[PDB]
């Protein structure tokens, strides 16, 4: 009795239609009860009930029963939501024909017109045959919510949703491979499509939500290195404002800015401090947020020997004068072998202003021998202004602040340049990005449009380790992944000249993995005992091998990147030749691939891309594919997330058979197991990893994490060649 439709015209309720819909959705699921759902939603029905509401109600009801004991509610809820969205976009369950759709969308100005220019009507007709609209039924409720929330093309004001998952995927493919010769184009299109729609390859949000639409902005994070000059500060700041406006995460290197008290122009003026400028970089970053809060994240880097280091370290400590506080930015302290050595011998650390010690800053990253040489020399030189601190106090203060906030990050510069793809003398890595996984070379700007500056970019993607059956499937995946990302660099726009320079010069990529924990659980391994060490060595060998292979093949076809000659790769040096030698004591897995045959091929034909792998965290991307986040172990068997439409629940993949194989985050006794796996991964990764450190106060006497243990874990990490250190989770149930 009495329902109202979308035109707002009354029809009577037919309660068996609803039933059928539910009945259909439940197909193949175990432990879901249609009755249960009917009961909980029928009671909320009323005369004059809009149809849309009817769907919302059953969806929610189904969704509210998601649990560890009945995980298939995830799919029952999802399908019902897929169905609803189908009707919401097309007016019927059946999606229109690709061509008609594109045409309409192009006319409405939601899709790029170039699509109709690049592909013929017949071509679209061919693509349509690839599409399998039934793949939409494999999504999990949490995934569908992400899709509906930030991927699908819609009108945010009105709430109209214009497309469905499969069209997204096929058109993303079409755009990325649109310049390919007609004799291969569509073969790639299909292959890519299959890879991404069956969750083998995962793509970042910017790409998924934008590629196929009129926009050209697709980079998520940027790296800017700032010079020690008002001209360069200004330029830097300008760049940041440009990039944060396009929702990009920023990574700033402000280590060269001189110290407070330092002489300016002669003796005519004395420097004011770095603080004042850091505050100015903060305002730049938050320039396009609501008030000065929402969005725009940045991570600032500085050497640990900077003269102002003690004032920089406590920039987040809430308890202090506003004047000496830059609270809304994360910081990365740069450390090298010498610094740790001073700590172990219990000696002192000498702090200097970059300006007063010629050649020290450069040596710090590029040559440890020379760094040491100059560092000692300047220590004695009495003319140099300097200040001594106990190694132990400095380290303690940093760890303290790291522990308190969890946002004081570490970057081992020496490791970053001794075991990298680049030659430190020509292009050293001197900073990282927001989430500490990118390591690329940068050169400071002297103006926003300065053509000789360099700004690195994050071009990302990831392999789903839960979706491949054997490591030899990576060969194909690598081919698609490297090829679509390489084409994207030539497709997207570059606001600042310096960002285009690096992008075209070196064509750098950052491909990592998702579902690592689940993958280990399937193989019956755990993080903390070292049982996964040899499997992880074997897995990451394959990944890096096939990525390098794919880039090399592309190089033959389209030519190596212009600045390929600055890489170590160009001099016949591979990741297996420069890794930290202590790794040999924690893993004996042998190399299964022909690295020598590849060594030659790279030397001869070069690489299309200078960097290929990087292990980034991934919240959104993992949800769509119902997977565990990046390499991290899951916090619990059910994840909870709040939304306007209700509480979102997502159950770990294959809980039903693997609940006992999983090792949850706080089940680990310590950080050793994880830290070793991280180090083993770094042997083959071209760039860096977003490694975390986790501590549970309940396992310590009096609920207080010992300083002895924080330094212990810090040194361990360095010993196994870890390049960077991200969050520090300190559990508080």
């Amino acid at each position: 009795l009495l329902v109202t439709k979308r035109d707002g015209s009354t029809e009577r309720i037919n309660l068996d239609k609803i039933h059928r819909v539910l009945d259909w959705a439940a197909e193949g699921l175990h432990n879901v009860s249609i009755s249960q759902v009917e009961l909980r939603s029928h009671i909320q029905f009323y005369d004059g009930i809009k149809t849309s509401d009817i769907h919302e109600t059953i969806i929610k009801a189904a969704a509210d029963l998601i649990s560890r004991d009945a995980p298939d509610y995830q799919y029952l809820a999802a399908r019902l939501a897929i169905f609803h969205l189908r009707k919401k976009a097309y007016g019927q369950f059946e999606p229109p024909a690709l061509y008609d759709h594109v045409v309409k969308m192009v006319e409405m100005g939601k899709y790029d017109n170039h699509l109709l220019e690049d592909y013929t009507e017949e071509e679209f007709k061919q693509m349509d045959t690839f599409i399998d609209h039934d793949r939409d039924m494999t999504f999990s409720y949490a995934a569908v919510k992400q899709l509906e929330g930030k991927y699908l093309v819609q009108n945010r004001v009105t709430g109209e949703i214009y497309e469905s998952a499969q069209f997204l995927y096929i058109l993303v493919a079409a755009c990325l491979f649109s310049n390919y010769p007609r004799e291969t184009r569509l073969q790639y299109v299909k292959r890519f499509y299959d890879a991404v729609s069956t969750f083998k390859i995962s793509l970042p949000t910017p790409i998924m939500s934008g590629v196929r639409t009129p926009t050209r902005q697709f980079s998520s994070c940027v790296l800017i290195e700032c010079g020690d000059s008002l001209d360069s500060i200004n330029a830097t700041s300008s760049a940041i404002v440009k990039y944060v406006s396009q929702r990009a995460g920023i990574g700033i290197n402000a280590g060269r800015i001189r110290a407070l008290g330092s002489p300016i122009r002669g003796g005519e003026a004395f420097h004011t401090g770095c603080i004042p400028f850091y505050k100015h970089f903060q305002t730049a970053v938050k320039s396009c947020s609501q008030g000065g809060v929402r969005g725009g994240a940045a991570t600032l880097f500085y050497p640990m020997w900077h003269l102002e280091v003690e004032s920089l370290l406590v920039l987040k400590n809430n308890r202090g004068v506003e004047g000496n506080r830059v609270r809304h930015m994360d910081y990365g302290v740069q450390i090298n072998k010498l610094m740790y050595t001073r700590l172990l011998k219990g000696e002192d650390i000498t702090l200097f202003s970059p300006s007063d010690v010629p050649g020290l800053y450069d040596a710090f990253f590029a040559d440890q021998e020379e760094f040491e040489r100059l560092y000692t020399k300047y220590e004695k030189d009495d003319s140099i202004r300097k200040q001594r601190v106990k190694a132990v106090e400095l380290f303690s203060l940093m760890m303290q602040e790291r522990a308190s906030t969890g946002r004081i990050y570490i970057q081992n510069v020496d490791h970053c340049n001794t075991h990298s793809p680049f030659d430190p003398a020509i292009a050293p890595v001197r900073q990282s990005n927001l989430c500490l996984e990118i390591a690329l070379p940068t050169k400071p700007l002297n103006d926003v449009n300065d053509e000789n500056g360099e700004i690195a970019l994050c071009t990302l993607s990831a392999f789903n380790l839960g979706a491949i059956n054997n490591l030899d499937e990576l060969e194909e995946l690598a081919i698609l992944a490297v090829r679509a990302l390489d084409a994207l660099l030539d497709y997207q726009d570059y606001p600042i000249p310096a960002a285009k320079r690096g992008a075209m010069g070196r064509r750098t990529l950052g491909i990592g993995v998702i579902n690592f924990a689940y993958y280990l659980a399937k193989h019956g391994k755990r993080y903390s005992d070292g049982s996964a060490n040899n499997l992880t060595h074997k897995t990451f060998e394959a990944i890096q091998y096939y990525l390098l292979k794919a880039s090399n093949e592309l190089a033959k076809e389209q030519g190596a990147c212009p600045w390929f000659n600055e890489t170590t790769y160009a001099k016949g040096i591979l990741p297996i030749d420069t890794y930290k030698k202590d790794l040999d004591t924690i893993a004996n897995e042998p190399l299964h691939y022909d690295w020598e045959a590849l060594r030659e091929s790279i030397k001869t034909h070069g690489l299309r891309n200078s960097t290929l792998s990087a292990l980034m965290p991934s919240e959104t991307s993992s949800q769509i594919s119902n997977a565990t986040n990046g390499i991290e172990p899951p916090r619990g068997y059910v994840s909870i997330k709040a939304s306007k439409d209700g509480i979102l629940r997502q159950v770990v993949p294959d809980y039903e058979h693997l609940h006992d194989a999983y090792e949850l985050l706080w089940e680990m006794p310590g950080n050793d197991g994880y830290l070793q796996l991280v180090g083993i991964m770094q042997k083959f990764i071209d760039q860096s990893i977003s490694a975390n450190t986790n501590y549970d106060p309940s396992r310590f006497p009096s609920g207080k994490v010992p300083m002895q243990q924080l330094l212990k874990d810090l040194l361990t990490a360095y010993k196994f060649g870890v390049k960077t250190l991200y969050y520090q989770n300190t559990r508080d149930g």
């Binding site: 300083m707 330094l711 212990k712």
Partner: peptide, 13 residues
């Protein structure tokens, strides 16, 4: 915040 240098000293970077 208690730190022992000796226990670290023997560590091999």
């Amino acid at each position: 915040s208690e730190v022992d240098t000796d226990d670290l000293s023997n560590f091999q970077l």
